[PDB]
Amino acid sequence: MKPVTLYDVAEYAGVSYQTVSRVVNQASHVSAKTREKVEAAMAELNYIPNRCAQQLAGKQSL
Amino acid sequence: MKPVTLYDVAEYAGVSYQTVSRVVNQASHVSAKTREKVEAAMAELNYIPNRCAQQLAGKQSL
DNA sequence: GAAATGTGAGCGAGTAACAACCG
DNA sequence: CGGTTGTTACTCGCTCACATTTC
Numbered sequence: 001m002k003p004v005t006l007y008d009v010a011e012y013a014g015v016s017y018q019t020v021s022r023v024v025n026q027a028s029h030v031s032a033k034t035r036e037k038v039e040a041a042m043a044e045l046n047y048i049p050n051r052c053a054q055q056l057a058g059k060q061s062l
Numbered sequence: 063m064k065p066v067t068l069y070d071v072a073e074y075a076g077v078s079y080q081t082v083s084r085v086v087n088q089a090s091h092v093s094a095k096t097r098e099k100v101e102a103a104m105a106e107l108n109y110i111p112n113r114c115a116q117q118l119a120g121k122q123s124l
Numbered sequence: 125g126a127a128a129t130g131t132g133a134g135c136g137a138g139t140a141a142c143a144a145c146c147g
Numbered sequence: 148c149g150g151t152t153g154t155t156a157c158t159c160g161c162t163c164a165c166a167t168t169t170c
Contacts, residue, residue, distance in 0.1 A: 003124075003160090005159085005160060005161085006160070006161070006162095007160085015129080015130085016129060016130045016131075017130090017160095017161090018129075018130070018131085018132095018161095018162075018163090019128095019129065019130080021160095021161065021162055021163085022128095022129090022162085022163095024161090024162090025162070025163090028127095028128095029126090029127055029128050029129085030127090030128065030129085031127090031128065031129085034128080034129075049160095049161085050159090050160055050161070051114075051161090052113070052114030052115075052117065052118060052124070052159095052160075052161090053114065053118055053135090053159070053160030053161040053162085054160080054161055054162070055114065055161090056112075056114055056115060056118060056135055056136060056137095056159090056160075056161065056162090057134075057135055057160085057161050057162040057163070058134075058135060058161095058162075058163075059135095059162085060065075060112075060136095067135090067136060067137075068136075068137055068138085069136080069137085077152080077153090078152070078153045078154075079137085079138095079153085079154085079155090080139085080140090080152075080153055080154075080155095081151085081152060081153080082137095083137075083138055083139070084151095084152090086138090087138090087139090090151090091149095091150060091151050091152080092151080092152095093150075093151065093152080096151080096152080111137085112136060112137070114136085114137095114160095115135080115136035115137045115138085115159095116136080116137060116138065117137095117159085118135095118136075118137080118138095118158080118159045118160060118161090119136070119137045119138040119139080119158075119159070120137090120138060120139070120157090120158065120159070121137090121138070121139095
């Protein structure tokens, strides 16, 4: 099982690898068109957000 | 803070970040004195290995 | 000037490589 | 002769911070 990443989703959606990250946490300062693109791309690739790295970026709230 | 970073340990022990992991690796070119120095910070600071970080660092643990 | 997206760096830890250095 | 230490960054997978962009 290949661990999908936001890079896969963003590339497929046609956006920056960050755009997919903003929807998973808040989604402030984003256009609906960009958001739908992001969400549909993550479902098609069956990408699962890796929480290990999510908290790694400066959180660790578990 | 109990779960400190290896950088935190490296500093306390008075060594490099390279030798700090070496002690844990318990296989590299690690001198006896070196491990004693490092393990001191480990206990004093209570180094806790982050499964998420260790795995993200290139260790396919998940 | 502010929304929005892209560019970029940082986080945590592990590992890799050669060369100098003292024992 | 050689065991050993080191710097420094890469790299994961992510997310925030900022720079740019444009109206």
